[PDB]
Symmetry: D2
Subunit: 485 residues, 4 copies
């Protein structure tokens, strides 16, 4: 038995854009992402799969079923987001000097909130209230996230930017987006604080800037290749996080955190330990040092409006990244972590998922304890899961990672919950529906949900608050012999 604290909660995470659409009446055509995945040129280039999110699992209409299943599974926590574009589909009046690099303050008061109120879509606001009330009524603790990637089209036209035209709405490249995000987040907390337990400002901002402007083969909007603009986007999103933290805190006393995409950086050989540290600096610490300690590079300074803007860390973890020392610095290696062949084995002989991500549960222990030792902020594992339609690997994946969280808590790290990605299959961004991460399988023709055996395993864990004696063998690597190489 591996028993968790009585206060520890097991649950799940999901995103608005990935799960909401699919039921008639749910369509939200007003985001950069919606436009991006419908774009004829993006489709012909293979940048997007050609699958469309309006053919999705239909959480917007079927949320009661989702929650019914989650309750039956014994889950006690959920993290979801509201979609900005649903609440504000139309442009807000110009507010603020757009040529200034820093946004140190965004003034938000009761009167400003009442004015914003008149622009908000009330149908969407009432529907979300209904979803969240139904959620709370199952005994689910609620982490509300403000942002999980799609921006209102009125703030970002991604095709224009892709084409190299910067005269239009430019998303995270514009401080206008920073200003409006602060206001949006304060406004949502204002409307939903009676229902919310904890807040996150945003999900995986590092991936928004990284894949949007560098990893362009990923087919993320706006797919404009530029080191400089990637830096600018990330600078703005950092500021946006701090201003959203102040915004929410002006209307709420509840915890405000952020959810980040992590990898566990591992040395190729014993001579690469420094390369791991440089990787951790470049991918993790630079970002969190900004929003926790105010340390940022604009020249390297301390910004008082950034310092201390975080109560908790949401750890998203899937796999490792193996690095080696170079003359110039360090490189990441293909054949490990997220850079493997699909349904195969890595260069280390470890099985890979439908997405080609390597099985490496130790990485989660590494990430949790590293964060804990540097900052001593409490954590939630806000995502962990595997693309696995067949459910071959998931039972092992689930048990092993949950064990590593036990390991972290045992070593002294304050981790308060584990949220699996995800409860049901959903739209996997540029990859479409083929990457199936659900504990429950979705038949997209009927929107019916099915329990993969892993869901039965998770029920065992959640209802007992433990990896029970009977499933402890699943804390191991999926046998590779019967799997594809």
């Amino acid at each position: 038995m591996y028993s968790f604290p009585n206060s520890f909660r097991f649950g799940w995470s999901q995103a608005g854009f990935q799960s909401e659409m699919g039921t008639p009446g749910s369509e939200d055509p007003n985001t950069d992402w919606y436009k991006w995945v419908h774009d004829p040129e993006n489709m012909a280039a293979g940048l997007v799969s050609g699958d469309l999110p309006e053919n999705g699992p239909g959480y917007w209409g079927n949320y009661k079923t989702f929650h019914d299943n989650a309750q039956k599974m014994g889950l006690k926590i959920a993290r979801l987001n509201v979609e900005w574009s649903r609440i504000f589909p139309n442009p807000l009046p110009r507010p603020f000097d757009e040529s200034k690099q820093d946004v140190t303050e965004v003034e938000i008061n009761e009167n400003e909130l009442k004015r914003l109120d008149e622009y908000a879509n009330k149908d969407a606001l009432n529907h979300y209230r209904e979803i969240f009330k139904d959620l709370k009524s199952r005994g689910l603790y609620f982490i509300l996230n403000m942002y999980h990637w799609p921006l209102p089209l009125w703030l970002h036209d991604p095709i224009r930017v892709r084409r190299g035209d910067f005269t239009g709405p430019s998303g995270w490249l514009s401080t206008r987006t920073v200003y409006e995000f602060a206001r949006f987040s304060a406004y949502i907390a204002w409307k939903f604080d009676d229902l919310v337990d904890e807040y996150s400002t945003m999900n995986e901002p590092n991936v928004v800037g990284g894949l949007g402007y560098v990893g362009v083969k990923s087919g993320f909007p706006p797919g404009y290749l530029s080191f400089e603009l990637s830096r600018r986007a990330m600078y703005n999103i950092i500021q946006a996080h701090a201003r959203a933290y102040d915004g929410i805190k002006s209307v709420s006393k509840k915890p405000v955190g952020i959810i980040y995409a992590n990898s566990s950086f591992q040395p190729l050989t014993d001579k690469d330990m420094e390369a791991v540290e440089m990787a951790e600096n470049d991918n993790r610490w630079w970002f969190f040092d900004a929003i926790i300690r105010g340390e940022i590079t604009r020249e390297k300074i301390v910004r008082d409006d950034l310092k201390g803007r975080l109560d908790w860390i949401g750890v998203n973890y899937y796999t490792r990244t193996v690095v080696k020392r170079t003359e110039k610095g360090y490189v990441s290696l293909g054949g490990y972590g997220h850079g493997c062949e699909r349904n195969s084995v890595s260069l280390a002989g470890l099985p890979t998922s439908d997405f080609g991500w390597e099985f490496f549960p130790e990485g989660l222990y590494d990430v949790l304890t590293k964060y804990w030792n540097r900052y001593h902020l409490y954590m939630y594992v806000t995502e962990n899961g595997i693309a696995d339609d067949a459910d071959y690997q998931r039972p092992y994946y689930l048990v092993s990672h949950v064990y590593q969280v036990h390991r972290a808590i045992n070593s002294g790290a304050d981790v308060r919950g584990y949220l699996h990605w995800s409860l049901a299959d959903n739209y996997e961004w540029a990859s479409g529906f083929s990457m199936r991460f659900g504990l429950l399988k979705v038949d997209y023709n009927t929107k019916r949900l099915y329990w993969r055996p892993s869901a039965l395993v998770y029920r065992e864990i959640a209802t007992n608050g433990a990896i029970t004696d009977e499933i402890e063998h699943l804390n191991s690597v999926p046998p590779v012999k019967p799997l594809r190489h």
Copy 2:
């Protein structure tokens, strides 16, 4: 939902030799099989794996745990055997003319039973009583089987016979074995009838004679290659079944059946339908026509002492056998059914098990309905399962086959239960421990049992008496893309 009749029972089957040993005090060195798998020459030849049954899952001592788990799984029926050698480890006094081919009658009465009683091991008899009482106390309906392959060494010395020496105890080649089996079966029914719900005389007699004397590469005792002796063994085992039926019926009013190894014979092309029929004659109907209709070949006759000696049919089913028409008759084809590569795909593209057996659940519907249409005797599916340590295929295997049983009942066949092979991993004959068929995994170092996700799936089925809506997707073929080819 696929709902079963209120009287239908879900459970499991296991064998004495495969599951009993493993706990100190359980050792039974007194069978042909025990001697056979310890034989130095057999081990050097690779005829046996070198694994030894005394290192087994230890049901003899740990039966309460087995039954605890079965109860938790919601199982309502069990089929087990007593091991002949445990009850009579020492030779019985010569009784009877051994040169006569036919055994038409074996006289058994109260006084003869009392005499047999004085030779029986009382420790073994009391232990079995304890096991079976514990079984009944969980609400498990009890099918007791008399014979599941091992013979007392005093009736068969398999190494002598392997060596081509026929002067010693010769097992099924001797009518003495027929005579003593009748007596044994009457005696066991006499002792245990208060605990037993239904009886089977024997398990897979076709495999005893087939692999023992023809399929010699299988490493089954006595491994003496001879068409003629294979025929003689089968003739004797048929007689033994009839005499055991009369024996039990002299002491009990309860149903007496037999459990047989079936395959579903399938045509390679649409021009091979007759080849299927010939295969069904040669592997199934010849045997059941003997014990039901008394029709046998000795010249082709009707034996009144054989006729009508069967109340029910135990169907063991794993996979198909594909056949084609020949000039001389028909042949079975490699690359399908049980003749495939391990952890691969068949020539039809269907996944194969750890044992190289092809996934083919339709065959079960074929077998059940064929038996029903010919004889109209009720059935139990007494075995169905898969060698699958990883549990990749089993959830699909289980749900799909259970669905086919529903299909059979729906078409009018009287099938009263489904017993999975098996509850836990066990000693797979010449293959040893590497072929793992359990719903529960056995750690052979500690004898601890673990729930594979399939066991959680079976619990869903058994406690609901249905394939529930939530697991219905598992009524399909395991996706082959992620599996080894």
Copy 3:
């Protein structure tokens, strides 16, 4: 036995950028492609592999060794290109009588005086070196097809990074009629200098890939990687008129045959209800292009241009694999899991083995392509490329024999096909994929630049020296057994 006509030639094709660099003194840093593969951002994005052409097989310096092996192998034809960038590494004077705003380039006047002026700007070391290469080539008894263009443009004509970035103020490559005008002059000029050594000419190699991958298939990491249906059309329009202008140019200085080399796929129907889909795909991918440069038919409205009509003497067929199509409401789509859209070192959805590149084994498609061209246009052809990425040499013996057989089959059916040129003699730099895709009959050790005979090279030698698939190797006219290969 499958015997070829006495006049039929077996040989190979090779590209300047892919094979020249690798030996000291061979570097050519002056193309869009060179800058493209060195670009930090392209590398970080994984658009390019990070391998660099200057570490290549070194044909610039080692050409005598290549030719030695080709001669030993009994090869009798070669097709190679001159790199534009090496001849004119610096810009030429903005030209006379040229209006860059006009859509059409119907004429480019080139005379002897103009050629002599051009000659002042040409790099003489490069010119002499190419003469030395080509002379050595002819001395081995190789018939020489000289191609003018195999993808890289001089940087002064195309800055691909600027264009990737969406800045159209600089040298814009095939988006600018200046490039059309200069290509005409370049082609006439090369023909003027080398015609004593050349047997036949090709203007361009795979122009459909330049425009297609450049401006639509942007994941391929081809320059300038700017995603635009509109600009792909403009590029292709310009390349077509560039071809026609280059044909006139060469013809002004030479009597020899002038053709073009094109990237072909055999379009195959998913089901028997998709035959029309194949036709549409053949229209969209092949006939529209050749109808323009043969029949002058083009869309600008659908028109006939007299300056385009009849500008082709022969067709170079580049063939690797099929594309499977199906009918749609809107039209037709290509299917993944067949043709060039398969997993590497695996099997297609039809159970056919795939190459190191994920390309499906389908020799029948070559017979399809050759006979379809023949029946439409009745212009003679060469198979100018056919080969497989296969470092281990598992599949190549089968690949080679099977495709060579399909050419035999085409000739037998009446198609005029005069040679077969394997891609390629030796491993080389495979564009955005770098060195890992190895197409050579000969293996290259990139550390030493030593060449090695893969067993397929011994098989090709049998074919070429006999002018036949001989009885002893005829079994290779089959599909590589899939059971022992990866799935």
Copy 4:
């Protein structure tokens, strides 16, 4: 370059039973092996494949074509056997001065008068046919090693079905000293008839396999398939004394070298703590046998037999793969998942590719075996077998070049090794496995009996005509890439 001594010969080995039959008139129904593979019960049990040798590659009739190809391939040595059964298909007279109850056969007297008597019983058509084959062989410049025995015994000496059934009253093969006595006479007789054509002699091929698989490894489906440690020892005891008696026999009629061909495996330690295990395995599988026929050391009690001592001029090394061993309390065990105990068309537990037969790629083992023999006995050797079951020819080019290199390495270290004979020239009947295991440099189409050159055959021709691994094929001295192969 890896160059071999001028006197070194490259060639091939072949067996009578595996290759002779297939052409009209070639049938030899008179062996234990023939009856064994036709047996209904053996077939139903899957002990034998159901393929029949009479449908074979047809060397009996087509030998001129085999030799033609071998000559074209530049081969300079061949090792072949005469089939006992074809020469003496009927029983010979119960002999003079012979006591069948005696364990030891220390002497078999054979004189000219005895030879002339034997000659009355010999099949003259078979004798003349073999002369014709061997004459054609020598006329291609092939040096000829004639082996006396390659497994099948005349049925009058061994009824394997009777023995399988546990009936020891009939002809019992190597279980009877009569077979020892007759083999001596047979060998002397063949040497007497053919010595003008023979260069060197081998008495037997792989006797350890005859006894090992016959009486212990019964799943292999080798006759008589009777499982008995005791009878395996008796068979091996008789085969050893048969070899010694055959050596004396041949030597009575010829001055030429007489050796033996043996089935070798390179024993390799699982971990660095298993070096002693290797030694024990080498004792149990190799040295015990050769210590008997070279040093006369045998166990009957451990004794020296003067009639056994010194009965060997040369060692024929048959080598395919390794065996990995580990230390046990009782001694040592061989491990599955390495060597000959792997999955077919896969990878071993060490990640090395396996053949169609499930045999692991391990060329280093050949260097091990050759040098170990050399250091113990200092008798010259031939590599009399080395090859791979590989119908597709994926691995064979690497297999061949790598093993040939290891022989170069052995010679360099000082071992006297005088030739390398690939198994085999053409596909043939692989015993209980039938035709599906294809070992040929040449592919056989069993329908037409036509031979085809697999690319490995072109590679071997390079080796043999140059007496070297040439620079151009040296890259094949490596492991077949595993990524594109099945795992």
